[PDB]
Amino acid sequence: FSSLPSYAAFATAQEAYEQAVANGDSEVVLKKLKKSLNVAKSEFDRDAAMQRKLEKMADQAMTQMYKQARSEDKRAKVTSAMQTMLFTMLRKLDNDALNNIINNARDGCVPLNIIPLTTAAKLMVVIPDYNTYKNTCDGTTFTYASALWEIQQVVDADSKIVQLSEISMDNSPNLAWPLIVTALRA
Amino acid sequence: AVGACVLCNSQTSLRCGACIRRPFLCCKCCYDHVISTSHKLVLSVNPYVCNAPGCDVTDVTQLYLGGMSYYCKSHKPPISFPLCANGQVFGLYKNTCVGSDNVTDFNAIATCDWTNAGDYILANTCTERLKLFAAETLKATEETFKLSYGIATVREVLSDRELHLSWEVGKPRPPLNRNYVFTGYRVTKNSKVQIGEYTFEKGDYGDAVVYRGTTTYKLNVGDYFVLTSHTVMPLSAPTLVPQEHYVRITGLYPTLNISDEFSSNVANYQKVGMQKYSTLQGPPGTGKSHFAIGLALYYPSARIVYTACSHAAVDALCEKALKYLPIDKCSRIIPARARVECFDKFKVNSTLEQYVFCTVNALPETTADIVVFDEISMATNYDLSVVNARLRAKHYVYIGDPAQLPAPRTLLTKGTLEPEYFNSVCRLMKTIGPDMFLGTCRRCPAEIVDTVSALVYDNKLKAHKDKSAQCFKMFYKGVITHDVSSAINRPQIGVVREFLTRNPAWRKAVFISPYNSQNAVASKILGLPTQTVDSSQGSEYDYVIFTQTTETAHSCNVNRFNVAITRAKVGILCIMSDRDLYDKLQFTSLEIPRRN
Amino acid sequence: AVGACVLCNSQTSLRCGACIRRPFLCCKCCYDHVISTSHKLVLSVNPYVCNAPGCDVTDVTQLYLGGMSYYCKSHKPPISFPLCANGQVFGLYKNTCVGSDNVTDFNAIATCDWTNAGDYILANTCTERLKLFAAETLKATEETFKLSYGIATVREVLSDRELHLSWEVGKPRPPLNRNYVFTGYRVTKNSKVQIGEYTFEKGDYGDAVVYRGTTTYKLNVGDYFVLTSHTVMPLSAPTLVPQEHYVRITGLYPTLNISDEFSSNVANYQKVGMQKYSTLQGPPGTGKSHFAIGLALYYPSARIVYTACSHAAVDALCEKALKYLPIDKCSRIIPARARVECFDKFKVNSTLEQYVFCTVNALPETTADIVVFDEISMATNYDLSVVNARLRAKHYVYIGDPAQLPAPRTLLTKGTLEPEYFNSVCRLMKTIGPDMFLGTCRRCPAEIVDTVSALVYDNKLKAHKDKSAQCFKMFYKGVITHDVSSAINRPQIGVVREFLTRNPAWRKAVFISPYNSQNAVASKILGLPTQTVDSSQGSEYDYVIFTQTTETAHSCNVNRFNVAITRAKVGILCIMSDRDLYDKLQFTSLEIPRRN
RNA sequence: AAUAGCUUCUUAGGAGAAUGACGUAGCAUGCUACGC
RNA sequence: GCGUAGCAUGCUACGUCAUUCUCCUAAGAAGCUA
Ligand SMILES: Nc1ncnc2c1ncn2[C@@H]1O[C@H](COP(=O)(O)OP(=O)(O)O)[C@@H](O)[C@H]1O
Ligand SMILES: Nc1ncnc2c1ncn2[C@@H]1O[C@H](COP(=O)(O)OP(=O)(O)O)[C@@H](O)[C@H]1O
Ligand SMILES: [Mg+2]
Ligand SMILES: [Mg+2]
Ligand SMILES: [Zn+2]
Ligand SMILES: [Zn+2]
Ligand SMILES: [Zn+2]
Ligand SMILES: [Zn+2]
Ligand SMILES: [Zn+2]
Ligand SMILES: [Zn+2]
């Protein structure tokens, strides 16, 4: 604001006007100095308002640029995350048996549920009671979905281990049911 | 899109799209680059072009930021301030931009063309970021130069190895050369398929050329061939890691004693443990790859990588390497490429064994203890940074001798390039030496090592089996009987017309000559096959009849002379004007009209 | 950003910037700290400096609260208020702080430089909160003094473990012992960077030293070693838990008759279970820690923790515990520290073992039934606060003797501290009574304890196992080759020459010496490993070898002689200038060549 | 740690309107110095 | 009768400052209903 050309002209105009008033000449110089300071303050209002607009305009633009950069950064990061998860998921599936059954299918279309139902190598039974235990997965091997599995670890609800001996009709209450028992295809 | 200025490293969002590579520039730095050159377009996180429809002005110096976009001086709204002011163009972090005044050499890079020697000498003598940026830029220029070329239509397909391929109409034919690997195509009508990659060679005559292919899916007469290309990838890693010596073997667990014939090398093998990375100069004929595989054996409990540039170099590497190594090995480079047949021993993707042999341009993401890089008098800035980017090992050694030749690098046409300025590693190998020198050669005759150590070497390498019959019959060169732009020195060949009979035990010798046409016209009236050193550096012979050419500096390059003399077992003859060179090599000089 | 008045416990929002630790001060309390002490930097939620650019009036007495921002008198806002007014300083909760008259003592503790016994003797007897504050500020002060001395550089490169050091001429040099480690900065120009941590050892000759670094870096000539910093965290928990009594035993369960060989202590084994905390004064060489293990048996399943100040002491006691307890015992002392090594038995971090043996520096924050600190004569109020803070148990028992050797207290160079004033626990041990007494020293040659009786003690101890073969050769103190300010009387070891082979069965003694470097010299021309008096105080040995130094004030401390001779079982000799002390020790001394 | 609707409160911004005051220009009227 | 000038007053336009109002946007904290 102070650096505007009107600033110095206005300041020295008011100064010399006060000087001439201390000289006490005829009022025509009073009218002249009034006119001078008037136009000076007019253009001063002009430039002051211009700078006031410029501040807000520049700040809006700058915060806008910050927002744009932020959006682009997050976007690139999320795309990388998605691609990574996709590829690390893919590189897991048992490609052999899957290739087998799909290429066996007459079109390349197979309903989804049978995909795990016939190519999974695991089985996470969940049991809510000793009775359904007795009647689904007794002993060390069992049969389900037309294939032969075998137990390998029986973790209870507290994420502890439970030796296959502990699960007995009289040893029901001490085991915090349900009983997440895994397995393995065989 | 926020990055680091290539000169000020302060966070910024400015790029010169007028520059082919678009590097990040701080405010003041881009100011200096944009005031001085013809680089007259700047792009922020959004382009700085007048938003007014029909206003196609580009440079920011005539632009004012208005409401929420930027306009030319014409369509500007009332409140609108210029984007260039106080040495700052409007962008992010204007108050934290530090900048500098190194604009000079940066501008030199931004304006050069890569067609003169001084360009390269600057490009290999500049700052680090400056170095890598020069690398990327020159590589892109050579990429578009390759792509500036075009097609080649098959006139006839003689055989799986002999070919009649006519080249594009009105086009400067890409020469008969190994590097340019040609991708082929056969359009059905309807989905032209890519028939693979193939390499060519100047055969026994014209027009028919010799060639090799990656696939046995045979070519046709309707196919057309261009050569292959890509897009240049950005780089981050430095050219070379800083030096680090050590007081002991930092985890290098050596062998006990086995293969004591490498005792001449264990003296250096200790030093490998003593330093972080270093160099070694093995002149052709020396214990290289013997040093290397003996080093592998000496430290047998550490993963090792080996690397070179071309398939020829990498198989020459893995050979003599399959020998001293239980196998139990890997050299796994290329799944679906390699115009010439390549590794045929093991898997594709398992990074199985501790020793792998590949090429820099094809390395996958691998970790190991040490990477041994031979062939370094050929490599340039780019491959070094790729190496640092892909292999974070515990040791490194650059193997090789700068006395060999540089790359084709076709764009150099005003001057020549010196080894001390080939690239950084050779600059070190010449400004301080290899720091580790290997002696000595064994294969070549001593008469061609001690006599040739007088030139660029410092008389430090030796050999044996001096005999026999190696003399230089200096013929006074004739006029330039050039058919093609390169000379045909048949007057020089005018010394062999009375020679096919006077060499009793020399019939399977090798005519070699620098000009490809000097091999072709000789192959027309020929008695023995020609192979210039470009296909050599990987090929050995017993005799050789090297024929020089016009007295231009091309023929009398001492580096090419060394690489063309040190490729024989028993025999060599030199035929040149040779006012001074035959004074540094000492044999019985002979004259042409005398048979003695 | 609130807290409690360190003197009045009201909420306050202020701190003294000039005071070293910047403690919270109530309003009037801060007024009094600032009125008559040169400290004038007071920090509120924001600092109190005048916010006028370029105005630096920093005395809080000369500022004014303006509107939103405080200022100086000249730059003051139109209307505002004076800050320091009516004996108060405008701070949050201005009206509701009480403020007290502990002003003089706090002023003293704040301004003092601790170089005279006033600070110790006063912190030993002041208010608990004030006590802890004095402890933290004394630690921080000595830490800041650590910064005063200078840097080390390299002078010449010789080998991997033989270097010549160069002290910055004109600054206090650091003592060459294991307790000093420095980071190695190398200045290229351009990468002034740390290389790793280093520790030194003065070898048999200067200026060569043998040293160890954490890394195997190759030491160049552009390297140097700068001391590594240390800080102090604030502590809140009490030092001495308020005493409590009962009429029954809770949390601990008695035993019937087990281990009758620990009989006499049961009468005190019960009162410990009856009270909240208690102490045992053990005269030198008494049945201390015997009582400890005996109570540990008496209450078997009661979880127990042992702690002390000396690593040698905690090692000795953990070994003695290994001697008689089920194991079933851990000493989680130190994983990767303790330059002089210790246990290699069991875990460091599992928090499962019943009887946890640990050191103050590595105490965890767990619970237990009973914890026992040991050797109270060395630890300080700070250490007391740590050991009371990290743990929490039912009953507390401390065992020690005020007549042992206290902490170093380097800045203490004028005056002396009586046994009582080593810390608060020692104070209570020197109060109306140590409240539990057991005195008889049998692990020592009975004659030496009979002389210890004639020394500062009041002739009240008895023993067995008197004989034999003890004396004191008052050889004249030769030239002290004091590299460090610690003595080296090699001419005194200049008589050890006549005791290297002359002793047929006196071979596995342990050597004691007053100064650290006259122990180092016994570690230079070695006949057996030696230890200092600080490493002593807790172990007894069959024979003892002792070469003293000049009559310096540090040497002639009778308590040191006690804690030295009390480490004997059957043998001892002394080599002291000894103008008078030989008339005090009652044995059969001889001369140099009279050893038959 | 969901979809949707309503409502109380706080801040910033914009826009608009009213009001009052200051200053510049122009328009109208009057009084008067001067000139014809 | 005219103009220059000055003063005073009314009107219009513009450009500043303050008060209020209105609406719209944005952002945030809390509640209720299906
Ligand atoms: N100590 C040695 N004794 C015999 N031959 C050796 C010895 N060292 C190296 N060589 C031989 O040199 C020959 C290969 O040299 P080469 O590897 O062709 O040279 P360069 O590797 O420098 O290009 C091999 O026959 C190799 O055994
Ligand atoms: N009741 C006891 N019977 C036999 N020896 C005892 C008895 N009490 C303590 N001691 C012995 O005192 C010796 C150790 O004393 P020490 O612990 O060296 O003294 P101090 O601990 O005071 O420095 C040990 O051999 C220990 O058994
Ligand atoms: Mg080799
Ligand atoms: Mg003890
Ligand atoms: Zn910059
Ligand atoms: Zn540019
Ligand atoms: Zn425009
Ligand atoms: Zn107080
Ligand atoms: Zn203070
Ligand atoms: Zn001020």
GROMACS .gro file of C-alpha atoms and ligand atoms in nm, chain B residues 16 18-19 23 25 33 37 39 106 110, ligand 6:
model
   11
  202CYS     CA    1   0.901  -2.725  -1.777
  204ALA     CA    2   0.896  -2.737  -2.287
  205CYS     CA    3   1.164  -2.972  -2.158
  209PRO     CA    4   1.194  -3.194  -1.413
  211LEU     CA    5   1.203  -2.668  -1.065
  219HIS     CA    6   1.540  -2.108  -1.708
  223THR     CA    7   1.597  -1.982  -2.338
  225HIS     CA    8   1.172  -2.289  -2.313
  292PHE     CA    9   2.154  -2.676  -1.644
  296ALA     CA   10   1.850  -2.806  -2.170
 1454ZN      ZN   11   1.297  -2.601  -1.921
   0.00000   0.00000   0.00000
